[PDB]
Amino acid sequence: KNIDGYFKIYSKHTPINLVRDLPQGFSALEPLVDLPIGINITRFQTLL
Amino acid sequence: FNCYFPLQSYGFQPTNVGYQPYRVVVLSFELLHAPATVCGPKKSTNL
Numbered sequence: 001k002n003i004d005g006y007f008k009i010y011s012k013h014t015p016i017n018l019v020r021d022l023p024q025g026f027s028a029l030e031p032l033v034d035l036p037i038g039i040n041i042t043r044f045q046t047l048l
Numbered sequence: 049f050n051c052y053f054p055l056q057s058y059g060f061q062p063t064n065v066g067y068q069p070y071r072v073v074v075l076s077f078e079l080l081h082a083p084a085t086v087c088g089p090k091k092s093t094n095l
């Protein structure tokens with residue numbers, strides 16, 4: 001996400017032994033670094 | 049033609065007080081509402 005020109009990236013890497021769906025638990029995504037880009041965002045796609 | 053080259057090589061050379069060339073630099077600041085990218089030095093003090 002980007003707010004007030006500063007891109008805020010949040011991430012979290014946790015292990016799990018399950019392939020059905022999202023497991024039980026809580027996790028707060030931590031903003032690691034702030035990026036001053038200042039761009040509008042209304043569309044996006046995944047590059048695989 | 050009559051309308052000729054508007055550019056001209058400057059009259060200086062490794063040989064070349066009013067004819068001394070001066071260098072100039074400007075830091076064009078874009079003051080639009082945008083994320084801050086250049087800010088001043090905040091000299092911290094001892095605690």
Ligand SMILES: *[C@@H]1O[C@H](CO)[C@@H](O)[C@H](O)[C@H]1NC(C)=O
Pocket residue numbers: 038039040
């Ligand atoms: C974001 O949207 C505004 C809407 O007027 C537009 O002026 C601006 O150029 C857009 N941002 C970019 C990076 O194009």
